[PDB]
């Protein structure tokens, strides 16, 4: 079935490198759109990072030049290596794909995973 | 950026009651524009693509309309599982900017 | 003789982005007078030389790339740019030497029907080389399973067409756009 499984989140030190893994099946990295959608607790979503299939990256302006989106073509994942984490960093954060072309919607899906970052 | 407004911030209603979530852009949007269901412990999940065409396995229930500023999720007939919050999150043009949030409870 | 700048320009048709049709400039004088005096254009701006000096300045040839492009996507129209347009259907070099020119062409190019007749080749496996073209519609595999040409789940048609209309903002009518090369015959 379609899927996405997030992993590596939890408790971090501030620029701590828990690099969220996305694992995937039946689609090939290496040849689709993929992003960081996060969550503060009681917050609106937020967009983080996007890979276009040529490896095209991208960064929201709260998260520009301290993440760094990317992926493992022959594991079939996603990573997103965060520095400079804040106290405002503590989120749920899914990785999902908006269908590449802008037409379609938002089709492959995780169940997303709560970074949290306290002293 | 591009800011939006989601108008109302919180709604409630009696079942079957029609549910309109507003959504207002900056500039002309086009259509790229969706509409996303956000339940809590569950991943959100999409409405309308194409902002004007139902994503296979989407309930009938959602709908959606409009074009250039102004946005409006429909729903014809509210339903006991749709408690939920709502989000007008556009990919139209970089910077790409999620919706403020619309959360329905039934009465 | 006077250099064919009327054929690139004023013509009834030019190809779509993913399939733009390059022109090489033959021993011709060049009039710049006609492209600079003259301003029908949205756009008009050069790249490492001026919109005067290009008069008493000359070059070993010239490529004319003509191409559409809807207004906003015209700012993917540069060097060091990274949209979907740059990388999946027309990329200008870094070491760009040239004119990039953008005018509005809705009144020829959109219809009340939705115009489907331009494309833009969306979907592709890595980027392109310094003024790449690749007009191939290979089926679109996202996935492990072979699409065998046929498309479904992870096999999506990797041409994507435009859908131009009268009806939307200045950002979404369509742009015509030819961009002027030089490189190191043609002086005027």
Redesign the interface.
């Given at each position: 079935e379609v899927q996405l499984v997030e992993s590596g989140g939890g408790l971090v030190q501030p620029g701590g490198s828990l690099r969220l893994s996305c694992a995937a099946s039946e689609i090939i990295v290496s040849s689709n759109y993929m992003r960081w959608v996060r969550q503060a607790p009681g917050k609106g979503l937020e967009w983080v990072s996007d890979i276009y299939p040529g490896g095209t990256t991208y960064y929201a302006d709260s998260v520009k030049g301290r993440f760094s989106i990317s992926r493992d073509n022959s594991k079939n994942t996603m990573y997103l290596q965060m520095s400079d984490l804040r106290a405002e960093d503590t989120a749920v954060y899914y990785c999902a794909r908006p269908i590449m072309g802008g037409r379609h919607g938002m089709d492959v899906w995780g169940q997303g995973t709560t970074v949290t970052v306290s002293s | 950026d591009i800011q939006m407004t989601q108008s109302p911030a919180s709604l409630s209603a009696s079942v079957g009651d029609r549910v309109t979530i507003s959504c207002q852009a900056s500039q002309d949007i086009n259509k790229y524009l969706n509409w996303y269901q956000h339940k809590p412990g569950r991943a959100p999940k999409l409405l309308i693509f194409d902002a004007s065409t139902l994503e296979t396995g989407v309930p009938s229930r959602f709908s959606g309309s409009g074009s250039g500023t102004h946005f409006t999720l429909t729903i014809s007939s509210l339903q006991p599982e749709d408690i939920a919050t709502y989000y007008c999150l556009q990919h139209d043009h970089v910077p790409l900017t999620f919706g403020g949030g619309t959360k329905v409870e039934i009465k | 003789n006077l250099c064919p700048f009327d054929e690139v320009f004023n013509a009834t048709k030019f190809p779509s982005v993913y399939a733009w049709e390059r022109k090489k400039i033959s021993n011709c004088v060049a009039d710049y007078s006609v492209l600079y005096n003259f301003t029908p254009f949205s756009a008009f701006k050069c790249y490492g030389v001026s919109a005067t000096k290009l008069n008493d300045l000359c070059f070993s040839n010239v490529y004319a790339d003509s191409f559409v492009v809807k207004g906003?996507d015209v700012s993917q129209i540069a060097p060091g740019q990274?949209?979907?347009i740059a990388?999946?259907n027309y990329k200008l070099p870094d070491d760009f030497m040239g004119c990039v020119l953008a005018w509005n062409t809705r009144k020829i190019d959109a219809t009340s029907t939705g115009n489907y007749n331009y494309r833009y080749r969306?979907?592709?496996?890595?980027?392109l080389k310094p003024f790449e073209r690749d007009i191939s519609t290979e089926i679109?595999?996202?996935?492990?399973?072979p699409c065998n040409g046929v498309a479904g789940?992870?096999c999506?048609f990797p041409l994507?067409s435009y859908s131009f209309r009268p009806?939307?903002?200045?950002?979404?009518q369509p742009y015509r756009v030819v961009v002027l090369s030089f490189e190191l015959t043609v002086c005027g």
């Open positions: - | - | 906003n990274t949209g979907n990388d999946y969306l979907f592709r496996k890595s980027n679109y595999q996202a996935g492990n399973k789940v992870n999506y994507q009806t939307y903002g200045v950002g979404h």
